[PDB]
Each structure stands twice: as structure tokens, then as C-alpha cells.
Design a protein around this ligand. Structure first.
Ligand SMILES: CCCCCCCCCCCCCCCCCC(=O)OC[C@H](COP(=O)(O)OCCN)OC(=O)CCCCCCCCCCCCCCCCC
Ligand SMILES: CCCCCCCCCCCCCCCCCC(=O)OC[C@H](COP(=O)(O)OCCN)OC(=O)CCCCCCCCCCCCCCCCC
Ligand SMILES: C[C@H](CCC(=O)O)[C@H]1CC[C@H]2[C@@H]3CC[C@@H]4C[C@H](O)CC[C@]4(C)[C@H]3C[C@H](O)[C@]12C
Ligand SMILES: C[C@H](CCC(=O)O)[C@H]1CC[C@H]2[C@@H]3CC[C@@H]4C[C@H](O)CC[C@]4(C)[C@H]3C[C@H](O)[C@]12C
Ligand SMILES: C[C@H](CCC(=O)O)[C@H]1CC[C@H]2[C@@H]3CC[C@@H]4C[C@H](O)CC[C@]4(C)[C@H]3C[C@H](O)[C@]12C
Ligand SMILES: C[C@H](CCC(=O)O)[C@H]1CC[C@H]2[C@@H]3CC[C@@H]4C[C@H](O)CC[C@]4(C)[C@H]3C[C@H](O)[C@]12C
Ligand SMILES: C[C@H](CCC(=O)O)[C@H]1CC[C@H]2[C@@H]3CC[C@@H]4C[C@H](O)CC[C@]4(C)[C@H]3C[C@H](O)[C@]12C
Ligand SMILES: C[C@H](CCC(=O)O)[C@H]1CC[C@H]2[C@@H]3CC[C@@H]4C[C@H](O)CC[C@]4(C)[C@H]3C[C@H](O)[C@]12C
Ligand SMILES: C[C@H](CCC(=O)O)[C@H]1CC[C@H]2[C@@H]3CC[C@@H]4C[C@H](O)CC[C@]4(C)[C@H]3C[C@H](O)[C@]12C
Ligand SMILES: C[C@H](CCC(=O)O)[C@H]1CC[C@H]2[C@@H]3CC[C@@H]4C[C@H](O)CC[C@]4(C)[C@H]3C[C@H](O)[C@]12C
Ligand SMILES: C[C@H](CCC(=O)O)[C@H]1CC[C@H]2[C@@H]3CC[C@@H]4C[C@H](O)CC[C@]4(C)[C@H]3C[C@H](O)[C@]12C
Ligand SMILES: C[C@H](CCC(=O)O)[C@H]1CC[C@H]2[C@@H]3CC[C@@H]4C[C@H](O)CC[C@]4(C)[C@H]3C[C@H](O)[C@]12C
Ligand SMILES: C[C@H](CCC(=O)O)[C@H]1CC[C@H]2[C@@H]3CC[C@@H]4C[C@H](O)CC[C@]4(C)[C@H]3C[C@H](O)[C@]12C
Ligand SMILES: [Zn+2]
Ligand SMILES: [Zn+2]
Ligand SMILES: [Zn+2]
Ligand SMILES: [Zn+2]
Lengths: 321, 322
């Protein structure tokens, strides 16, 4: 069976799945925030000694927003890493995170990979890229959507692979682990009139012992079912649950928690972790709403927190095979 | 006796003292940096319970670069606070600090004041201003040079006083403590063609039990002798010791350690603390050189580390009165 294999107008990419048409969060007080969204020191600060591996995956650490660190099958990789305060081309305006990054880039050791779902300042953060590339160099491989190679090259990144969807590659030392850029329903833009000059997508990571899915930003299309059927079952999937209100505007580009759980099903993962949410105010929902709505969905679909969990900032979770 | 009381061309301010004419730092490796310039958690993180006061001053915490937290005579105040990574109007270019700020703005409680010496991205940091103002509001009074009021107002700061030199004011609750804007030899610029639209200076803080001096960025002029004589003796002075090489270009605007110790003498402080240095690479000296040269100066002038000390990032020091 074939898949959404996309896809251009004569210039930019469009989504092509037909669920696409081209059509009050309120935090404050340092005490309440710490109460509701505490920031934990990741394990690797006081126990830098080992992780990943061991021997059959799989460990994840939520570093906020859509940044997760994943340890499996002898690799540690990083998704959409944003360690800066502001997701913006400007110092002066644009969204400031209200929970600090749980660690600095000087802690970590990504061997040998990062995964970028789309450009977009809250996923592709120049200062984070620079810092990562200053620290590791060649020794870090960047997997990015078709059309971003150049941008990364100009940041000084030399070990970069650019992918159309359903295209696949690995990290040179570790050929047993396939990285596949898979579809998603979203968009790209960093400047004026660059709309969708670069692809957006999800990542399916296929190792000998484990399989991990990273949704990126989306919502809700076939494709998740295509992915679920082509790869899958997956062991863990990271799926956004924030930035969804108001529905009439956001639904084409952002799942709500209900739709998040439909992706969880469609993709055939044993478990999922909530990302996006709780970090930047990018839409109108009360900053604590997404986890509440997640649980309402789970209850409705006959599932459980065990199946689709939300971490604290900086928390880790081990998933035994 | 009178003082350099300055001073304009017909537009911008100029220095007017005649020591003014209008004419390789190499860090790296996380391990070495932590070895040479460790970053300490300030006391107020695990012991937020009391400071300052007690009862007769004075406590200081070095937060990096020219940002110092000072506790005396029932106030806590903050100088040139920069808690961001990059001193720049851009995200994309401009100097990145190589030692992280030792704390976030969410730790602290400045009652009720910040002191700005000059505009200039490594001393006036927008994101730090916004964050401070978001946290405290009206409760925090900002003392700034003549010409900066509006800029601050547009940041949303509502409790702001602007001062020419030798002008004085206090924090409303605490009238026993006088803040005086005093001269310095430096310059101002944030954009194109705004050179010296806003004054630059130092701050003399006069309390019932203590007196503190903050040099700002400068190099070496009379004025420090004017300040030493008008106010003074001082209990503590914070004085820059980095950003001085190459001398032929920088000496009109930045003291070297040697000149730092001349300021220490001129200003008649019992003690001084090194600031500027060790945080951003703003000039050409080896990042560790300033402290070495400071000690060579101290030795030459018959003084001691006890007289003019350097802190680690985030370290505090208490100075008991007498
Ligand atoms: C002339 C003056 C021009 C002034 C413009 C100043 C712009 C500064 C603020 C930029 C806003 C950053 C937005 C953060 C971001 O990337 O996320 C918003 C959006 C995607 O976020 P997502 O998680 O998908 O949620 C969807 C929310 N609707 O992501 C995006 O929309 C992409 C950002 C589009 C705006 C980029 C504009 C750059 C302009 C530079 C021009 C300079 C000319 C000289
Ligand atoms: C057209 C393109 C224009 C491109 C310009 C991009 C500039 C980005 C880098 C800015 C550099 C930041 C410098 C950091 C800083 O404030 O300190 C340097 C100097 C004072 O530092 P100090 O401790 O006194 O040491 C002296 C060093 N000689 O401080 C200074 O000199 C003040 C900074 C002057 C540069 C400001 C330029 C702003 C330009 C915005 C124009 C936009 C037009 C559209
Ligand atoms: C240069 C000043 C800052 C001066 C200061 O800090 O005192 C800043 C403040 C606001 C900044 C502008 C914000 C809007 C635009 C943002 C774009 O992404 C780049 C160009 C513009 C036009 C920016 C140009 C420049 O970055 C400005 C004008
Ligand atoms: C920073 C200068 C003005 C500085 C001055 O008055 O000297 C002003 C003048 C024009 C200003 C822009 C006008 C259009 C926009 C209006 C928005 O509400 C905020 C962002 C923008 C992009 C503004 C950003 C910034 O506030 C600018 C660039
Ligand atoms: C301007 C500096 C170079 C400064 C120097 O020469 O020292 C360079 C170095 C890296 C450059 C960026 C690389 C990533 C991007 C490449 C894009 O096609 C244009 C925008 C960006 C964001 C570039 C903007 C700018 O051109 C930067 C920041
Ligand atoms: C105005 C210069 C002309 C180049 C030059 O001066 O040599 C052009 C060249 C490329 C243009 C910038 C590069 C980044 C973006 C390219 C976008 O597609 C339009 C917005 C931006 C931010 C552009 C704004 C500006 O118009 C630039 C800088
Ligand atoms: C908007 C892109 C960033 C695009 C990206 O991050 O991918 C950035 C990259 C370099 C940026 C330019 C750097 C030089 C200038 C800095 C000034 O202080 C404000 C205007 C200029 C002209 C900036 C405009 C804008 O801020 C640019 C063009
Ligand atoms: C970011 C655009 C180009 C993006 C593109 O080609 O599409 C480029 C085009 C012109 C570039 C500027 C040219 C003059 C400067 C050259 C310096 O060595 C780095 C800073 C400046 C200020 C550059 C900053 C930035 O690198 C710009 C604005
Ligand atoms: C200031 C930082 C680095 C300072 C540091 O981290 O130590 C660097 C990064 C990019 C550099 C700027 C790029 C644009 C300009 C390049 C020209 O040749 C003249 C110097 C300028 C104005 C540079 C000023 C300074 O050399 C910058 C801003
Ligand atoms: C552009 C935003 C407003 C955004 C909004 O309307 O939400 C405003 C809010 C505060 C503004 C800044 C206040 C300090 C400065 C005032 C100067 O005279 C022009 C440059 C600065 C740096 C301003 C640039 C810009 O005009 C800002 C950043
Ligand atoms: C003179 C002002 C800045 C004065 C300041 O605020 O420091 C600067 C700002 C931008 C500078 C221009 C950049 C574009 C041109 C580049 C050429 O290589 C020299 C001539 C030009 C026309 C430059 C002339 C002069 O060097 C300018 C206009
Ligand atoms: C080009 C606009 C015109 C205002 C408008 O468009 O509404 C003007 C208004 C004020 C100007 C900016 C405000 C901040 C700075 C003012 C400086 O003296 C020159 C450089 C800057 C960064 C200016 C660049 C730019 O040229 C601006 C934004
Ligand atoms: C280096 C390019 C010129 C490239 C060219 O001529 O084609 C020019 C264009 C704009 C120039 C900058 C204008 C703003 C600053 C003004 C200062 O008074 C000198 C340092 C800076 C940062 C200038 C240094 C540098 O010379 C720039 C970036
Ligand atoms: Zn996003
Ligand atoms: Zn997005
Ligand atoms: Zn300075
Ligand atoms: Zn300065």
C-alpha cells in the first residue's frame, strides 16, 4: 500500500492530504509556576556516567517544548533543540519561554544526532545550533527536512543530511539504526515570502531493539496511519498536545489532545509522551489545559496515563523492552 | 573646590577632562574554564533568608562582568545588570559571555534599586530590564544617566530617575541613603549616529553606615580625585580591570589594572572589588591577565589583595564596618 509521498505546487511544498485548507493562556508568579511546572535537574548533571543503551533501550528526557533527548540502541539523539529563552529572530519581541531550559548545552553528549522537524523558531533555534555545533562538530550528524541543508551549512554544520519524506539514512558508526523522515501536516516559514520553501515532517527511528516516533508539529491527517502501518509497532512516540486553541484557526496545523491520542493509536506505539505544551505561550489555551484534556481523551478512548504520559521539565523515563 | 561639571558640544556630551582624545583573549574547553573561573551558586539561592543590612552594612555579590549586587543600610541594589548570554542588539552576532550568569532574575530581591552607568550593550541589557521590570514594577527604582529616562520608560519602567553629574536622589522609603551620579571618562552608543546622546558616569552611594562607589566603565581621569575628596572615605568600590588592550586605542575609555589601582587610591576607598573582566571577551588581553596585572599594580603601590580583591563568579563578600 502506497503513502502520501509529497509534493509541490511549482515552488513551495503543500500538504496534499485533504484535511488541510489554507485558512488567554495566563501564567504568572514564580511560586505558582514552580508548584505546577517544576524544573528538575536532569540525571546526567549529577550522574553524567552512562546513558543511553542498556542493552535494549530506551530512555527519554523531556527538555521542554519539543526538545527531547532519546537514548536507544547505542545512540543519544536530540529533537528540535531550543536552549534559548526566546523563540524569535529578534531579541526584542517574540515568545519568551516561561519555564527555563532544564540544562545547558554544556551538559549532554548527542552521539551522533539531532532531528529537526521543521524550521520555525520554537523548533529550529540558531543560538542552540551554533552552541551545539561549537561543542561537537563533525561528530554530530544533523537530520533535517528537504530544503534546510544550506541553512545548516551556513551555521557551520558540516555533517548534515537533508531528506524528502520516506527517505532514510543512518549515523555512520551505527548503521543498524535507520532514521526516516516521515510526513506530517504543518508548514514552514522563517522570514518574508519563504513560506514552505523547506519541508516539515516527523521522524521515525528504527533500531534493532527499539523504535521511536517523533511527531514534530502537526495535526491530524492520514499519514500517521501510513507510518503506523509501514513501520510500527513503535516503542515510544513523542506527540504534541499544546498550541491548539482556537480550534477554528489552529486545527489544520496543530492537533489538540484528543487528536494527539488518535495519532498515538494511528501510529501503533506502545506508549507516548506529551511534547510542545507547558513551555511557551503559542496559542490561547490556559497553560495547564493540555494535560487535563489529554486525560479526558485517554479516558474516552479506553486508555490510561500509563499509555500516554506527561513528564515534568527535565524528568526522564526508562522504557524496558 | 569645584569639579568637572559636564558638559556639551552643542548636541552630544563630551568628556572635557584633557586625558580624553577622540582616537587574543583566547578561552576554550569547559573543563579549563571551570578550573579557572568557576561559577558559584550565590548564597541567596539556598539561603534566601536574610540579606542585606545587619546592621551597619555591607555585603556584595559579583554576578559577573559589571553586575554587582550590593546590600547596605537596608537596601539591596543592582548595578549594570546583564543576565542574558549575548551583549548585542542582535541574536546572531555580538559578544557571548563565556561564563554563565550565576543566577536568574527569578532569584534576588532589589529594594528598591538598579544603577546604570552608561548605555552599551554589556551594561544596559534589554532582556534583563524587561525581566526585572516584569518581576518588581513600581517597587524597583532605576537610577540612570541624563538622557536615558525615555528609553527606560519605553521598556515599561515607571519608577525612574535620570541624573546629570553631581546630581543626587534617594529611594523614597529610605531617604537616609543618597545616590549620586558622578563623573567618569567613557562614552555612549546603542545605534547609528546616537553617539553620546546619553551621559556615562559612576555612582557614589552614601548611607548612614556605609559608602559604596561604582566606577562604571572609564579610564583614567581627574574626577576620581574629585569624588574621593567630595565624598569619601568609601567603604567599598567596584572598579573595572578588564577590556584594556591594546593600550594605544583603549586607554582613553578603559583603565588597565594599574589605572584601576590609581582610581582605588584617588577615590579613597578602604577596599575595592574588580569588575568588568572574566565574563565577555571585549578586547585583546588574555582572559586571565587582568587579575595578574592587578596584583602587579598592588605590589608596586605598596598594597595588598586584601585592599583590592577579585571574586569568583557568584561569590559574596561581607565588609564589617571599621
Ligand atoms: C519590517 C519589520 C518586520 C517586523 C517583524 C518582526 C518579527 C518578530 C517576531 C517573530 C515571531 C516569532 C514566532 C515564533 C514562531 O516561530 O512560532 C510561530 C510560528 C509557528 O509556531 P507553531 O508551534 O507552529 O504554532 C503556530 C502559532 N500560530 O512561526 C512563524 O510564524 C514563523 C515566523 C514568521 C515571522 C518572521 C519575520 C522575520 C522578518 C525579518 C525581516 C527583516 C527585514 C529587514
Ligand atoms: C545595516 C547593518 C548594520 C549591522 C550592525 C550589526 C551590529 C551587531 C553587533 C553589535 C556589537 C555589540 C557591541 C557590544 C557592546 O556594547 O560593547 C562594545 C562597545 C562598548 O564596550 P566597552 O565595555 O566600553 O568596551 C569597548 C570596546 N571597544 O559598545 C558599542 O559600540 C555600542 C554598539 C554599536 C553598534 C550598534 C549598531 C546597531 C545597528 C542597528 C541598525 C539597524 C538598521 C536597520
Ligand atoms: C537596533 C534596535 C535596538 C536598539 C537598542 O537596543 O537600544 C532594534 C530594536 C527593534 C529592532 C527592529 C525590530 C523589527 C524588525 C525585526 C526584524 O527581525 C529585523 C529588522 C527590525 C526592523 C529590527 C531592527 C533592529 O533590530 C531594531 C530597530
Ligand atoms: C524602534 C523604532 C522606533 C525608534 C525610535 O522611535 O527612534 C520603531 C519604529 C517603527 C517600529 C515598528 C513599526 C511596525 C511594527 C509595529 C508593532 O507595534 C511592533 C513591531 C514593529 C515592526 C515596530 C518595531 C519598532 O518598534 C520600530 C522599528
Ligand atoms: C553575519 C554572520 C557572520 C558574522 C561574521 O562574519 O563574523 C552570519 C554567520 C551565520 C549566519 C546565519 C546562518 C544561518 C542563516 C543562513 C540564512 O541564509 C540567512 C540567515 C542566517 C540566520 C545567517 C545570518 C548571518 O549571515 C549569520 C549569523
Ligand atoms: C536588503 C538586502 C540586500 C543584500 C545586501 O544588502 O547586500 C537583502 C538581502 C537578503 C535579505 C535579508 C536576508 C534574510 C531575509 C531574506 C528574506 O527573503 C527577506 C527578509 C530577510 C531578513 C532579508 C531582508 C533584506 O532585504 C536582505 C538583507
Ligand atoms: C531575520 C534574519 C534571521 C533569519 C533566520 O534566523 O533564519 C536575521 C539574520 C541577520 C539579521 C541582520 C543582521 C544585521 C542587522 C542587525 C541590526 O541589528 C538589525 C538589522 C540587520 C540587517 C539584521 C536583520 C535580521 O535580524 C537578520 C537578517
Ligand atoms: C542575511 C543576509 C543574506 C541572506 C540571503 O542571502 O538570503 C545577509 C546579506 C547581507 C548581509 C550583511 C552584509 C553586511 C555585513 C557583512 C558582515 O560580514 C556581517 C554583517 C553584515 C551586516 C551582513 C549580515 C547578513 O549576513 C546579511 C544581511
Ligand atoms: C563581537 C563579536 C565577538 C566578540 C566576542 O565574543 O568576543 C563578533 C561576532 C561578529 C562580529 C561583527 C560582524 C560585523 C562586523 C565585521 C567587520 O569586520 C567589522 C566588525 C563587526 C562589527 C563585527 C563586530 C565583532 O567583531 C562581532 C560582533
Ligand atoms: C516593538 C516592541 C513592542 C511589541 C508590541 O507592541 O507587542 C517594543 C516594546 C519595547 C520597545 C523597546 C523599548 C526600549 C527601546 C526604546 C527605543 O526608543 C527604541 C529601541 C527600544 C529597544 C524599543 C524597541 C521596540 O519598540 C520595543 C521592543
Ligand atoms: C557612517 C555610518 C555609521 C556611523 C556610526 O553610527 O557609527 C555607517 C553606517 C553604515 C555605513 C555604510 C554602509 C554601506 C556602505 C558600505 C561601504 O563599505 C562604505 C559606504 C557605505 C555607504 C557605509 C558608509 C558609512 O560607513 C555608514 C553609513
Ligand atoms: C526606517 C525607520 C522609519 C520609521 C518607520 O518606518 O516608521 C526608522 C525609524 C527609526 C529607525 C530605527 C530605530 C533604532 C535606530 C535609530 C537610529 O538613529 C538608527 C538605527 C535604528 C535601528 C533605526 C533604523 C530605521 O531606519 C528606523 C526604524
Ligand atoms: C562591513 C560592512 C560593509 C560591507 C560592504 O562595504 O559591502 C558594513 C555595513 C554596515 C557596517 C556597520 C554599521 C554599524 C556599525 C557602525 C560603526 O560605525 C562601525 C561598526 C558597524 C558594525 C559597521 C561595520 C561594518 O563595516 C558594516 C557591517
Ligand atoms: Zn511549534
Ligand atoms: Zn511550528
Ligand atoms: Zn563595558
Ligand atoms: Zn562601555
Amino acid at each position: 500500500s502506497k503513502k502520501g509521498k509529497d509534493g509541490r505546487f511549482v515552488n513551495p511544498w503543500p500538504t496534499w492530504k485533504n484535511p488541510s485548507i489554507p485558512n488567554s493562556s495566563v501564567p504568572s508568579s514564580k511560586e505558582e509556576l514552580d508548584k505546577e511546572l517544576p524544573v528538575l535537574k536532569p540525571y546526567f548533571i549529577t550522574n553524567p556516567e552512562e546513558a543511553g543503551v542498556r542493552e535494549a533501550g530506551l530512555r527519554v528526557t523531556w527538555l521542554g517544548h519539543a526538545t527531547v533527548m532519546v537514548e536507544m540502541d547505542e545512540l543519544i539523539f536530540l529533537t528540535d533543540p531550543i536552549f534559548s529563552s526566546r523563540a524569535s529572530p529578534s531579541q526584542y519581541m517574540g515568545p519568551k519561554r516561561f519555564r527555563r531550559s532544564p540544562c545547558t548545552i554544556s551538559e549532554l553528549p548527542p552521539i551522533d544526532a539531532v532531528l529537526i522537524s521543521h524550521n520555525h523558531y520554537d523548533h529550529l533555534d540558531y543560538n542552540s545550533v551554533i552552541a551545539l555545533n561549537e561543542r561537537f562538530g563533525n561528530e554530530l550528524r544533523w537530520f533535517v527536512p528537504l530544503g534546510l541543508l544550506d541553512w545548516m551549512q551556513k551555521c557551520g554544520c558540516e555533517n548534515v543530511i537533508e531528506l524528502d519524506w520516506w527517505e532514510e539514512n543512518c549515523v555512520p558508526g551505527h548503521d543498524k539504526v535507520t532514521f526516516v523522515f516521515t510526513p506530517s501536516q504543518h508548514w514552514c516559514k522563517r522570514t518574508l515570502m519563504d513560506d514552505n520553501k523547506v519541508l516539515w515532517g516527523s521522524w521515525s527511528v528504527l533500531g534493532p531493539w527499539n523504535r521511536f516516533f517523533f511527531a514534530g508539529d502537526t495535526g491530524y491527517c492520514p499519514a500517521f496511519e501510513e507510518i503506523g502501518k509501514r513501520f510500527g509497532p513503535f516503542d515510544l512516540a513523542a506527540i504534541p498536545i499544546g498550541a491548539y486553541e482556537p480550534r477554528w484557526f489552529m486545527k489544520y496545523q496543530h492537533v489538540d489532545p484528543e487528536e494527539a491520542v488518535r495519532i498515538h493509536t494511528d501510529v501503533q506505539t506502545k506508549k507516548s509522551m506529551a511534547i510542545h505544551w507547558g513551555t511557551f505561550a503559542l496559542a490561547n489555551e490556559h497553560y495547564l489545559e493540555p494535560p487535563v484534556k489529554l486525560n479526558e481523551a485517554l479516558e474516552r478512548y479506553g486508555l490510561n496515563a500509563e499509555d500516554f504520559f506527561v513528564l515534568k521539565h527535565g524528568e526522564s523515563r526508562y522504557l524496558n523492552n
